[PDB]
Design a protein around this ligand. Sequence first.
Ligand SMILES: Cc1cc2nc3c(=O)[nH]c(=O)nc-3n(C[C@H](O)[C@H](O)[C@H](O)COP(=O)(O)O)c2cc1C
Ligand SMILES: Cc1cc2nc3c(=O)[nH]c(=O)nc-3n(C[C@H](O)[C@H](O)[C@H](O)COP(=O)(O)O)c2cc1C
Ligand SMILES: Nc1ncnc2c1ncn2[C@@H]1O[C@H](COP(=O)(O)OP(=O)(O)OP(=O)(O)O)[C@@H](O)[C@H]1O
Ligand SMILES: Nc1ncnc2c1ncn2[C@@H]1O[C@H](COP(=O)(O)OP(=O)(O)OP(=O)(O)O)[C@@H](O)[C@H]1O
Ligand SMILES: [Mg+2]
Ligand SMILES: [Mg+2]
Ligand SMILES: [Mg+2]
Ligand SMILES: [Mg+2]
Lengths: 329, 329
Amino acid sequence: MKRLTYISKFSRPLSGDEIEAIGRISSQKNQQANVTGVLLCLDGIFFQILEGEAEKIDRIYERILADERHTDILCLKSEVEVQERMFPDWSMQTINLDENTDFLIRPIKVLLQTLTESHRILEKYTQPSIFKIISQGTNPLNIRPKAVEKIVFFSDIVSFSTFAEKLPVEEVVSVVNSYFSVCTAIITRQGGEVTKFIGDCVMAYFDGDCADQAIQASLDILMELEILRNSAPEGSPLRVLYSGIGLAKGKVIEGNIGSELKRDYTILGDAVNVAARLEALTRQLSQALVFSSEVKNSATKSWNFIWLTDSELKGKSESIDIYSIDNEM
Amino acid sequence: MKRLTYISKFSRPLSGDEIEAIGRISSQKNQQANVTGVLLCLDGIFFQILEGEAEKIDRIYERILADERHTDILCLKSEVEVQERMFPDWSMQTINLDENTDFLIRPIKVLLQTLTESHRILEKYTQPSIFKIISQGTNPLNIRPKAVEKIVFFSDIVSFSTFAEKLPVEEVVSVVNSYFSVCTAIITRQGGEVTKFIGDCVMAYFDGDCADQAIQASLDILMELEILRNSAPEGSPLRVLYSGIGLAKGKVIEGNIGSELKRDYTILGDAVNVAARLEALTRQLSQALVFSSEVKNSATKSWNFIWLTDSELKGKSESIDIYSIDNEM
Ligand SMILES: Cc1cc2nc3c(=O)[nH]c(=O)nc-3n(C[C@H](O)[C@H](O)[C@H](O)COP(=O)(O)O)c2cc1C
Ligand SMILES: Cc1cc2nc3c(=O)[nH]c(=O)nc-3n(C[C@H](O)[C@H](O)[C@H](O)COP(=O)(O)O)c2cc1C
Ligand SMILES: Nc1ncnc2c1ncn2[C@@H]1O[C@H](COP(=O)(O)OP(=O)(O)OP(=O)(O)O)[C@@H](O)[C@H]1O
Ligand SMILES: Nc1ncnc2c1ncn2[C@@H]1O[C@H](COP(=O)(O)OP(=O)(O)OP(=O)(O)O)[C@@H](O)[C@H]1O
Ligand SMILES: [Mg+2]
Ligand SMILES: [Mg+2]
Ligand SMILES: [Mg+2]
Ligand SMILES: [Mg+2]
């Protein structure tokens, strides 16, 4: 079996009979698939529990994901292989109004309002990979730190401080947020994790056997930024948004790092230093992507590698050879 | 008027009549202070709404804060000057059991369980200053970016990478988390904000007219670390936990910066670069604290300033004079 719990936001205002139409189609199909649960409706927010055989649940949840009548869908729990059915049937409750609101539905309802509003805001400040772990029933705070091989990614906007002395502050922030959105979408598509924003810099990492994905993400970011520059409106600062990218590979510590008022699930280790130094090297090179020989050698695809001089980095143990990609330049 | 909403965690297991004793004393005193609301009890979690005149509310909430029977108290909303009383009276509900659990208290109750468990975890990953803004009824996502003068603080563990090649990974993380806990407590006490952890480094900031508080925090961190080293158990790695600290002052942009899966409320600007460079300079100096002449000159107390040579930084516009504190060395 399987039980899913999720919360979503109205993509637009939904009338009375519109939300009741939801409940009807859902009841019809869930009854067909032996799926029980409940769909609660509050002020512009949906919450729903649904349980049944994973195949039938996986199909339904995915029709729900495609539904354009709501957005910001966050799965709160994914309980794979449940032993007991929590609900005898499936139905819909519209508590936004009343439904016999006494001294026990009134306080409950406000608590759900306040908690959900707060949860929805906290979500936007939370590293994206935390939620998934919670859905799996494992508390990410209790993950023990471990040594793991990773590919570290650093990227950093070229000449940001200039944007800052030529644009109003709202426009500066819009440029940096556009950059981070471009980078985040591609890294995440290629299986990496954006772990930190450091000023105008993205720090990310990939599994240690994913050098090809890290290279592809980096090439795809460089190409997306070239398209963004070329397509920007006339006079847009995005026309001069450039980045450099550095990649390194090594053993790091992954775990919860921080204080008690705030922690991060992130990585520590020398490969972070190396990747950042390689990224900075792009300011002295024509290339916008640099990566270590360990990244080059761990890649499996026949990339158009170019060996850059012989390298002369500092702070490491050896001046490792450095590489980029030369795509018919 | 005023209405407070908050959630807390059991500091220890609480029996049946123990939690009912809560409700009795609360009803007695709230009835005396014309305070209405509700106290819900779920699995090891309290939620409570309380409303009344701010003075009487401020007194009660603070007796609640001191109560050792719960911990992790987070105010979810602080509605100052409420016009209408939301509750006619005050009472307690123990929904952990039943209280007529039909097809409408059962789903509600699970949603409260799941949401609260998720909220409590997200809290530990959230920059500490986000919650406060939410309590004030202002959505921090809607804060517009602004130019503001700040004192930037950077601190960074000396020779961390060594800890990493002499200790098991659980012990390495314990050392770094001890460091961040020491720094965070003092910065926050002195009115600053820890905004980011960058590997073994703390990034923080203070109001621009708070150079004295930033200096005091830095001196207090250095003294707390000296006490920690000296008091550590025999063989403890904390005995060799050292830090450097750099402080700079300047105009930065403060606002929400990030992508759509994750943003930070933080700062951008040159003073960040300067503070980090000054922090790094402590590795070439006997001093463990360095700060710019702008920090020195904006301080109002008669600190024991020492002018360090004449400075020769790079990347800035001028090799500004640098200072530290010499306390009868
Ligand atoms: C909050 C919300 C919850 C929904 N829950 C379900 C559900 O549980 N089962 C289902 O079949 N459709 C559900 N839907 C509707 C589906 O997305 C989709 O419209 C439905 O499968 C259409 O069925 P049809 O192919 O017969 O037209 C939900 C829609 C919304 C807005
Ligand atoms: C979840 C929880 C909620 C509480 N809420 C209240 C309250 O609303 N009003 C109050 O006077 N005491 C409340 N208390 C108890 C107070 O902390 C404190 O024990 C009480 O003021 C003692 O009153 P006394 O001075 O007469 O002994 C609460 C305790 C707990 C664990
Ligand atoms: N440029 C960087 N950006 C982000 N994180 C970094 C950077 N350089 C290092 N780190 C992180 O900091 C950790 C420690 O690196 P650091 O440069 O502080 O070395 P160290 O051994 O502590 O020596 P030092 O006395 O120079 O600080 C690294 O493992 C990595 O996690
Ligand atoms: N060492 C640092 N640690 C953390 N944040 C930094 C650091 N140095 C700079 N920043 C942040 O990055 C922003 C841009 O600084 P940066 O050094 O990237 O300059 P730039 O103008 O973008 O030039 P470049 O082409 O060298 O990257 C700074 O305003 C500051 O917010
Ligand atoms: Mg930059
Ligand atoms: Mg930068
Ligand atoms: Mg260090
Ligand atoms: Mg460091």
